[PDB]
Amino acid sequence: GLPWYRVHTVVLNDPGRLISVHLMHTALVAGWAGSMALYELAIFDSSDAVLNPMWRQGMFVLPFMARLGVTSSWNGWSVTGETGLDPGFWSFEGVAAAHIVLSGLLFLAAVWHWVFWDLELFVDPRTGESALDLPKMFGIHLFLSGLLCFGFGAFHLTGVWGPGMWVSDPYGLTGHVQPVAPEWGPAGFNPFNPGGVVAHHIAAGIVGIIAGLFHLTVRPPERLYKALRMGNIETVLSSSIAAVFFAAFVVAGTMWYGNATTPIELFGPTRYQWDKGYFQEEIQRRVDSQLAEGASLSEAWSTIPEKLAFYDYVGNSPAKGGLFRTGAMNSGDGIAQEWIGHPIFKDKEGRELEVRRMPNFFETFPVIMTDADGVVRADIPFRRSESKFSVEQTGVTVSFYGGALDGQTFSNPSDVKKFARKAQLGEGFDFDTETFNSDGVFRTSPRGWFTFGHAVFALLFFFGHIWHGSRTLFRDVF
Amino acid sequence: LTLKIAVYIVVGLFISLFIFGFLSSDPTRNPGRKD
Amino acid sequence: PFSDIVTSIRYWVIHSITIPMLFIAGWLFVSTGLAYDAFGTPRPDEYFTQTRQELPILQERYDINQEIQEFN
Amino acid sequence: RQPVELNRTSLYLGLLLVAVLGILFSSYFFN
Amino acid sequence: SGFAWWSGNARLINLSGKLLGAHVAHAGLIVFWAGAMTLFEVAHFIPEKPMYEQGLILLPHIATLGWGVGPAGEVTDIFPFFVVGVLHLISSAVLGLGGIYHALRGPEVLEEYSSFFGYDWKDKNQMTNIIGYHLILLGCGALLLVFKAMFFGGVYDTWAPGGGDVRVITNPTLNPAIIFGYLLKAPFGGEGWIISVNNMEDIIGGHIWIGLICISGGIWHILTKPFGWARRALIWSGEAYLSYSLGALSLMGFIASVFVWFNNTAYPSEFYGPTGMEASQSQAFTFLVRDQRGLGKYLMRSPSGEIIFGGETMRFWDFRGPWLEPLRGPNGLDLDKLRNDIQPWQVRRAAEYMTHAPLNYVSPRAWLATSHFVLGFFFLVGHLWHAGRARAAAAGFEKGIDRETEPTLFMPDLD
Amino acid sequence: QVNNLGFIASILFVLVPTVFLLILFIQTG
Amino acid sequence: ASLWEQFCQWVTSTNNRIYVGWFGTLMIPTLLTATTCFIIAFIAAPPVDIDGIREPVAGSLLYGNNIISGAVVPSSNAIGLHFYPIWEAASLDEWLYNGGPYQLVVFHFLIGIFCYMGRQWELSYRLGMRPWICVAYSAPVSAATAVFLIYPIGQGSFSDGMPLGISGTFNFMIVFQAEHNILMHPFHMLGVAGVFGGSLFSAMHGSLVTSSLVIVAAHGYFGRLIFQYASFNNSRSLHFFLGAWPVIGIWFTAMGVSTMAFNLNGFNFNQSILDSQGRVIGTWADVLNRANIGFEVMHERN
Amino acid sequence: AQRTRLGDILRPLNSEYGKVVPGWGTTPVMGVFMALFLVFLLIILQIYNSSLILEGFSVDWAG
Amino acid sequence: PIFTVRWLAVHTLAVPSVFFVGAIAAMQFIQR
Amino acid sequence: ESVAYILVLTMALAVLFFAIAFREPPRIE
Amino acid sequence: ERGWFDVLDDWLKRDRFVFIGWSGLLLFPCAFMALGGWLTGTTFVTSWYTHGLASSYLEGANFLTVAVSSPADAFGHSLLFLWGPEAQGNLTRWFQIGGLWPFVALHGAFGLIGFMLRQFEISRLVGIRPYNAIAFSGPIAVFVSVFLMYPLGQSSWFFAPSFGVAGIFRFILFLQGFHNWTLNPFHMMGVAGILGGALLCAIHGATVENTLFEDGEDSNTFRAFEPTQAEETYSMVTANRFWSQIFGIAFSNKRWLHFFMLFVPVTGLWMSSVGIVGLALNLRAYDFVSQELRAAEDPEFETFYTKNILLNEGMRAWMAPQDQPHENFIFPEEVLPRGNAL
Amino acid sequence: MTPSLANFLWSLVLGAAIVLIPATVGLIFISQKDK
Amino acid sequence: KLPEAYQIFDPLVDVLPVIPLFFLALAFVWQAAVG
Ligand code: CLA
Ligand SMILES: [Cl-]
Numbered sequence A: 001g002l003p004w005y006r007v008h009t010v011v012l013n014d015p016g017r018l019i020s021v022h023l024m025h026t027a028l029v030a031g032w033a034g035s036m037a038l039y040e041l042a043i044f045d046s047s048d049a050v051l052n053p054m055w056r057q058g059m060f061v062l063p064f065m066a067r068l069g070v071t072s073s074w075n076g077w078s079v080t081g082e083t084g085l086d087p088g089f090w091s092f093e094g095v096a097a098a099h100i101v102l103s104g105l106l107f108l109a110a111v112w113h114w115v116f117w118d119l120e121l122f123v124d125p126r127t128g129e130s131a132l133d134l135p136k137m138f139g140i141h142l143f144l145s146g147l148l149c150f151g152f153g154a155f156h157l158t159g160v161w162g163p164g165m166w167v168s169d170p171y172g173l174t175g176h177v178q179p180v181a182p183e184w185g186p187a188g189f190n191p192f193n194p195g196g197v198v199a200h201h202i203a204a205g206i207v208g209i210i211a212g213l214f215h216l217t218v219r220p221p222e223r224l225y226k227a228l229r230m231g232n233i234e235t236v237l238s239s240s241i242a243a244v245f246f247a248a249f250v251v252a253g254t255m256w257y258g259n260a261t262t263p264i265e266l267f268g269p270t271r272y273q274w275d276k277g278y279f280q281e282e283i284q285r286r287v288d289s290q291l292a293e294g295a296s297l298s299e300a301w302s303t304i305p306e307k308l309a310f311y312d313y314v315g316n317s318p319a320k321g322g323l324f325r326t327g328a329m330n331s332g333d334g335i336a337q338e339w340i341g342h343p344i345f346k347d348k349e350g351r352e353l354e355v356r357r358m359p360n361f362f363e364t365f366p367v368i369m370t371d372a373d374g375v376v377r378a379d380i381p382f383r384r385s386e387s388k389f390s391v392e393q394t395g396v397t398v399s400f401y402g403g404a405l406d407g408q409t410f411s412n413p414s415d416v417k418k419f420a421r422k423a424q425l426g427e428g429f430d431f432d433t434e435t436f437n438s439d440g441v442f443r444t445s446p447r448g449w450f451t452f453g454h455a456v457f458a459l460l461f462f463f464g465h466i467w468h469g470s471r472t473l474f475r476d477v478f
Numbered sequence B: 001l002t003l004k005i006a007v008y009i010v011v012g013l014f015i016s017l018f019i020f021g022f023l024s025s026d027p028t029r030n031p032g033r034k035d
Numbered sequence C: 001p002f003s004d005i006v007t008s009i010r011y012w013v014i015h016s017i018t019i020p021m022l023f024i025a026g027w028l029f030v031s032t033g034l035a036y037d038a039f040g041t042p043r044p045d046e047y048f049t050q051t052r053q054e055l056p057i058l059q060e061r062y063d064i065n066q067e068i069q070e071f072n
Numbered sequence D: 001r002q003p004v005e006l007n008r009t010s011l012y013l014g015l016l017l018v019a020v021l022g023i024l025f026s027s028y029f030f031n
Numbered sequence E: 001s002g003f004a005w006w007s008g009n010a011r012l013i014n015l016s017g018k019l020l021g022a023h024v025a026h027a028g029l030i031v032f033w034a035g036a037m038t039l040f041e042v043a044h045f046i047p048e049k050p051m052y053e054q055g056l057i058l059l060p061h062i063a064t065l066g067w068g069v070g071p072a073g074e075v076t077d078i079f080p081f082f083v084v085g086v087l088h089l090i091s092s093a094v095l096g097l098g099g100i101y102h103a104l105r106g107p108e109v110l111e112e113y114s115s116f117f118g119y120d121w122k123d124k125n126q127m128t129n130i131i132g133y134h135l136i137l138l139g140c141g142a143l144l145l146v147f148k149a150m151f152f153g154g155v156y157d158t159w160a161p162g163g164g165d166v167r168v169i170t171n172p173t174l175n176p177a178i179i180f181g182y183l184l185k186a187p188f189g190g191e192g193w194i195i196s197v198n199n200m201e202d203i204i205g206g207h208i209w210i211g212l213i214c215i216s217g218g219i220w221h222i223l224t225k226p227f228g229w230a231r232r233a234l235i236w237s238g239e240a241y242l243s244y245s246l247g248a249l250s251l252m253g254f255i256a257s258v259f260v261w262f263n264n265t266a267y268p269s270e271f272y273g274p275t276g277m278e279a280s281q282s283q284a285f286t287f288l289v290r291d292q293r294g295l296g297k298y299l300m301r302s303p304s305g306e307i308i309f310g311g312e313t314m315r316f317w318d319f320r321g322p323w324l325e326p327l328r329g330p331n332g333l334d335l336d337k338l339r340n341d342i343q344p345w346q347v348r349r350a351a352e353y354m355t356h357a358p359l360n361y362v363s364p365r366a367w368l369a370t371s372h373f374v375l376g377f378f379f380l381v382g383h384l385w386h387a388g389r390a391r392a393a394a395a396g397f398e399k400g401i402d403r404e405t406e407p408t409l410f411m412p413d414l415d
Numbered sequence F: 001q002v003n004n005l006g007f008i009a010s011i012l013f014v015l016v017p018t019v020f021l022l023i024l025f026i027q028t029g
Numbered sequence G: 001a002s003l004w005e006q007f008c009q010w011v012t013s014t015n016n017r018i019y020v021g022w023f024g025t026l027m028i029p030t031l032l033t034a035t036t037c038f039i040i041a042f043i044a045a046p047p048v049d050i051d052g053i054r055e056p057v058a059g060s061l062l063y064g065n066n067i068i069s070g071a072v073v074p075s076s077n078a079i080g081l082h083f084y085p086i087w088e089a090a091s092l093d094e095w096l097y098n099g100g101p102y103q104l105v106v107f108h109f110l111i112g113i114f115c116y117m118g119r120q121w122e123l124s125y126r127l128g129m130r131p132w133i134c135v136a137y138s139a140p141v142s143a144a145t146a147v148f149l150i151y152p153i154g155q156g157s158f159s160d161g162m163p164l165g166i167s168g169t170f171n172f173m174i175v176f177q178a179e180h181n182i183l184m185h186p187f188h189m190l191g192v193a194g195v196f197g198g199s200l201f202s203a204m205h206g207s208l209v210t211s212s213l214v215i216v217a218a219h220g221y222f223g224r225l226i227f228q229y230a231s232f233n234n235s236r237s238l239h240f241f242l243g244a245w246p247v248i249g250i251w252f253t254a255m256g257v258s259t260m261a262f263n264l265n266g267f268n269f270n271q272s273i274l275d276s277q278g279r280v281i282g283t284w285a286d287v288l289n290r291a292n293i294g295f296e297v298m299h300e301r302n
Numbered sequence H: 001a002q003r004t005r006l007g008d009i010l011r012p013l014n015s016e017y018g019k020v021v022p023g024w025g026t027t028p029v030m031g032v033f034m035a036l037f038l039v040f041l042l043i044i045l046q047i048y049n050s051s052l053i054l055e056g057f058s059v060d061w062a063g
Numbered sequence I: 001p002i003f004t005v006r007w008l009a010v011h012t013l014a015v016p017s018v019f020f021v022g023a024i025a026a027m028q029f030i031q032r
Numbered sequence J: 001e002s003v004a005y006i007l008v009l010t011m012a013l014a015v016l017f018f019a020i021a022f023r024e025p026p027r028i029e
Numbered sequence K: 001e002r003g004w005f006d007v008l009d010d011w012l013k014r015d016r017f018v019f020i021g022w023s024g025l026l027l028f029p030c031a032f033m034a035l036g037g038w039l040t041g042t043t044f045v046t047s048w049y050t051h052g053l054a055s056s057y058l059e060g061a062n063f064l065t066v067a068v069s070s071p072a073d074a075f076g077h078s079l080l081f082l083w084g085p086e087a088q089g090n091l092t093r094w095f096q097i098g099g100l101w102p103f104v105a106l107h108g109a110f111g112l113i114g115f116m117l118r119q120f121e122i123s124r125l126v127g128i129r130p131y132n133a134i135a136f137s138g139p140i141a142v143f144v145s146v147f148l149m150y151p152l153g154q155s156s157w158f159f160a161p162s163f164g165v166a167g168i169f170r171f172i173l174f175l176q177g178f179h180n181w182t183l184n185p186f187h188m189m190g191v192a193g194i195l196g197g198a199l200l201c202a203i204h205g206a207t208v209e210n211t212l213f214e215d216g217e218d219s220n221t222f223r224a225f226e227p228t229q230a231e232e233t234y235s236m237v238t239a240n241r242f243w244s245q246i247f248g249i250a251f252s253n254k255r256w257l258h259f260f261m262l263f264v265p266v267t268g269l270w271m272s273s274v275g276i277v278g279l280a281l282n283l284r285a286y287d288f289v290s291q292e293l294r295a296a297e298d299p300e301f302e303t304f305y306t307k308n309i310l311l312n313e314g315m316r317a318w319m320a321p322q323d324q325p326h327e328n329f330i331f332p333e334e335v336l337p338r339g340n341a342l
Numbered sequence L: 001m002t003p004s005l006a007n008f009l010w011s012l013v014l015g016a017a018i019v020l021i022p023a024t025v026g027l028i029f030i031s032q033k034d035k
Numbered sequence M: 001k002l003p004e005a006y007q008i009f010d011p012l013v014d015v016l017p018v019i020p021l022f023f024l025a026l027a028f029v030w031q032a033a034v035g
């Protein structure tokens, strides 16, 4: 009778068992959220938040709890970097337990609705058939979404009766949760303004209340009711699927490009901050403003926080991974331990050289050192070629400032080559490649896995839209 | 020697079986006319 | 329809003055060098200035008109 | 409504699709 | 009967008179091209520039027969090429006339008029008589090549000493062990099934046998009728006889495609240019006679044990050319025949041939080999089309399945 | 050095859909 | 009856579960020998010195390969176009080390797929059918012999045929592109028009026949979607176009790889646009050459 | 059909199935709001895309 | 009539067609 | 890794063999 | 009285030379802009300031080397409207900065939306199931993932395919050398779906043409069909027996047979689109780290996969300095990979 | 009111001057007279 | 190059080879027009 791909159509005209089949899906999603949080609380390394942040450990749902206020755990530690706080119940373990308990309660509601499906509430008296007033179901749910949106932005985000949301400096160095006030100017439409997410939820929530009230009290036009097939529940599945692949394309974009809702302390830096030298320029901005104070070359380069120098490393870029390079970034180059300092390369003629950094495209970039005029002065030959610009023919030396190798020099051409290969990846670090038995191939951050999962799901959900849109408009010939 | 001889025989077996199969009035083996 | 159109002359007498002059106006648009100026296409001697063989690759985003003018 | 049917031909079309997806993706899972 | 416009030549299958016109008229088109393309190629010929550097494919064919060429490939006379190209154009007018005549003015059917020319596609005795009339005539065109080589000036021998030459073949190889041993050489590397024929005495001696075998079979078919095993295995119709010939031309198109590709004896490099194997050996050889001023910087020792040119040219060690054999010994290339016995004509020829060696231009061998592989292929396609159609039409279901008597519906179920 | 979960992921990728299709085909006649 | 005609009856029997026929008496042993030797060599064959300077490529699963990277490696370059049966090697180790299993599989596979073509006609003949399904199947056959047999012959070595593997196929395509620029070859553009067009018509024919099921409403639909006459109102003319379009496009691209075997390459448009002073103005065809040059210089060894 | 206490309170909320206003109703008003909603999405798209640069702005992390 | 919807679908398609062909014909005589 | 590769390849052949030797006989409508 | 709407609605569905419908109000003005924008670009507009390349007929390029090519990487993902803050209404500057590329893409995007709406509107008109529209979702999935989603994941529109023949060929070798696209399993599924479609099209046409019913004495079988048949032209029973003895299996259901001709090519285009979304984020199936690890400890370990990693490394270094001129890549000859140095 | 904003507003007034006049009123007119 | 006596016929000699080609490219309207 029923093919395998049609077995779920048995609740198509059974409202009591569609509520039950939704209560079951809701229990499984809430059950995943609670047990994903418990699995991530089990493997999370809370020790270092600078060179082992959460996004380096593959934590996917742990940044989403911290985005809204849940920063500490019952075990004392926290993600902002402090220890021993008093979260109360609403820690990472309290939120995880509240989703496991919720999942268990939604499971029991699904069993009741699957057994007691023949409710007089769903029966239409005029014809005896089960019927759902879909235009008024929409008005009710729009009214509750309007209130839930409004109260979220008016009490939670504003901190009126909530924790606020995660904000940070432009360079992701001092990030925390604090009450954000709404921005009502045009500056609220700046994606990187945290106050525009608050002004949105108050305004979009208010609008969703008035529009909710309109749909509670004004019937559909007769021509829209028949055009859009407002009596068929599959026209709601076709419209909802459209709205959700629309929303999935947006969250995939705001994660990849970055905005206030996706900070880099939680999801890592974006691929565009490496293409544009976003952190490399701020580091030089800070150093040259110290060298302007008559400071030494190491005095200045020792004031750079290694967290800022850690964002300026191409292994942290979300566009350096592989589809089947699985796990945490720490399974790639390894657990970052410390910053080796800033290398200054100089040839035998006293020409300060710059190692060209690796673009996001290249799985392999040649090592090239140019001078202040972009002239190539030294390089590492390919494998065994004959060269005019070897590091042994040009006498390249490297001396470090700040970091672990401060005040040291290397003219041994084996170490000059080794430090030049670190320099084409940005700032150099020491990595613990023995904890996770790391390969040496870069992974992707949670910023890249989210963007990939949600751009693929948004594209797949476009097919489900046209497919269900064609089964609601062509319901007669099907 | 013996593997070259055995393959020459095996290949010799199958080729003339195919040859004598089509010489065996193969046009008459059809559900249509026969002539 | 279509049959009487192709098999008449009131179709073939206004086209005998309009397809030629629309083809010639296309010829002169290129012959007189107006196509290079309208679309900013470099003439076979405008690809480079008197010594720069640097490809005039656009670097900024909003002041292109100054850049295209400083490239030529 | 109706019970679930799955004839023998659709069982094969499924068993072939799964194993061939298992042949294609085994080398990337092992990496 | 009712063929569409795009299969209109199938309306001719049963019009023996009108089909004779389509054939004699088509034979004129072939003779026209061989006369018109020859006059084209001579009108665009620098008679001291290499014949291959000018895209000529028909003039190399006349040169190899010893017409208008001298020792080492100089064109001593440009008139004979013109006479050949003119003797074809005029004969093309005769054939084109007799095709236009039969197809338009002659009797549409020839059994009306003559029992000698009128043929039935199923009269097996008259069908074999026409093979005999043609086999006798093919064997005589094969002895024409033997008579040009032995008694009418000789053919061009590229293996003559000191560059090639036009040489009369006064001792053609007649021993069937050498002639019919070429038919039993493997078609693989080093063997070269019949492409390996590398002397004119074998080529001219092999056409003596072909001249007599085709006349032996021609008189055999005029005087006999098909045997029992021939009548039971074959299809006897007009479209079947065409499919048999299409498979024979398929086979010949491929053999000519590789013969012009490897062989340089019947396709001398003086006229067709070096083979792709000969251009690469010329390069290694030339680089050796320049750096002059089992190893030795361009030589190596084949796992055979033979001294061969080295590098990318290593795969072309089975190449044998007239300019490289004087310096080749029993165990491959001798190392002081290389150091002493290098004549200036070998240095000068092996520099001609490396011009287009690896590391714009298409050699006349690539044109002739790519052309006839493609034609050989599509003629195997047309054989399958016609062999299948001829045997379906013979059985009687080439127009579709009869709903009345569909043969599958009477068959029992498979499982 | 292969992925440690590569075997459990290559087996479940084939077993779980395979087991489902046989239960679906056995519980049908 | 005689034991021959009792064997000849079983061979030509249209009541066998799988038809043998007379072409199947050649196709079955050859394709079974090619199947047997391909699987053992894909799993457990030792590395093959394909380049001829003792630099063995590993191709089997038991030597550190997966399904994607595994291949049966072509014959050694020290073999060229020489016939290399087992008995022609002085050892079973020397045979494997020189790429022996590649010649055995390819030769049997080629014989088998041509006897497959005669066997498709043979059952055609004996079911009362028209015989031109073997003619459509000649298009994937010509493409197989082009890269297995024809291109090795033109290039002068069986090490130039396509490897029998997934990643060995991609390697064959890349170094073919580097030295022939097959993308700008027009027979390959017809082959792509053949597979992209054949796969459009497949989806186009499938979607209109399925839609038009509880019929004439299909042809009237496509009539509107295009001018009005872009469709064959004749179902037999439509299906002839269905088979002919990919068969012709694949025929051409198979005859394109076979002419490139003789180094007759695709289109060359390098150095095509210059300025008044002679400098090069690049097209999109010069960026392709840099990719071809980059693919090519990595392929040679000196 | 089983009756429940909760099902009897929600009964007036699932009573007007199928009831519509005749003709076009409020479709012109909806058509206006879909127009305003399209312009709005174009604005915030051109702001994010930096195709629409406004006063006192930088679509940038430092804002 | 004359100003049907084929007069527009043909002339917004052909007026640019003859102009561009006039331009491409002239480009063949740019001696570069 | 190599056993999993051989396990999935021999499964694809077992489906082919059963899909041919043990198939529900065709009932063309 | 038929107010202004259903008079307009009945006018858009009037039977004429081409069906306009409601979707034609989006298909026809956007298909004309996209194809007219591409012709104007491949005839007059250069890519000299964006790519450093001649790409128009005016510059002397031929049919295979013309392209409406990507904008400059400087603009990022700017939509580059004519009135936008880059060209600022200047139309000759808009052509020089590659503004024509989004113009063709965006109109091609909405033209493709209107054409798929055309299939829905015409199917609903004649009352059939719209399988042709959902079969067109394959092409639309490829277009938006390759021409929109891939450059958006990348740094700019510069890396989207150019609207040309050699410009498409450039996008093809780029994704091999930089992404190892052949190795990607989603491309392998798309290659199987298209080659499987061209096989179904070749084998279904041949099977119909050779199992034809003899419905005429004329030896032109094209004259034995006519539109109004209560029966089919070919014997499905004979065709099912041929392929069951030749191939082992055969179709029994013309409905399942034709859905398969629908499903195989459409699924291939949707699977390869999923792998292009991955390449947008450089989430590529580039390496098998088990064989890269072995090839590093063991120099003697060579695989056909490792042979391709080396081919890709050489293509990147020789192509990049001219494929990405804004990058200003200076690679000396000794850092350029070549086989003489391995 | 920035340049980018003034040109954006003109895009809505000149984009509606090809979708209102003569697009929707040219289809309304041609349909209200071919009726 | 043709002998001096026949260099008159040169422009027609340049056309002779393609004459077999364009009678195939003309018969496709001889038969097409008539039917
Ligand atoms: C969108 C949802 C989502 C996202 C973005 C992530 C993201 C992440 N997860 Mg997670 N996870 C999820 C859902 C998600 N997960 C769910 C639902 C579960 C429950 C099973 C888990 C359980 C889980 C565990 C146990 C772990 C993670 C980990 C991670 C991190 C690394 C993951 C990785 O290695 O990539 C791997 C991705 C792939 C290999 C891609 C698979 C693609 C498949 C094979 C496609 C199949 C093709 C299809 C069959 C063909 C179509 C058929 C056709 C014929 C029609 C990463 C940030 C890891 C971590 O870092 O720890 C903190 C970790 O250990 N996750
Ligand atoms: Cl290689």
Ligand SMILES: [Fe+2]
Pocket (backbone or CB within 6 Å): G209, K208
């Ligand atoms: Fe069909």
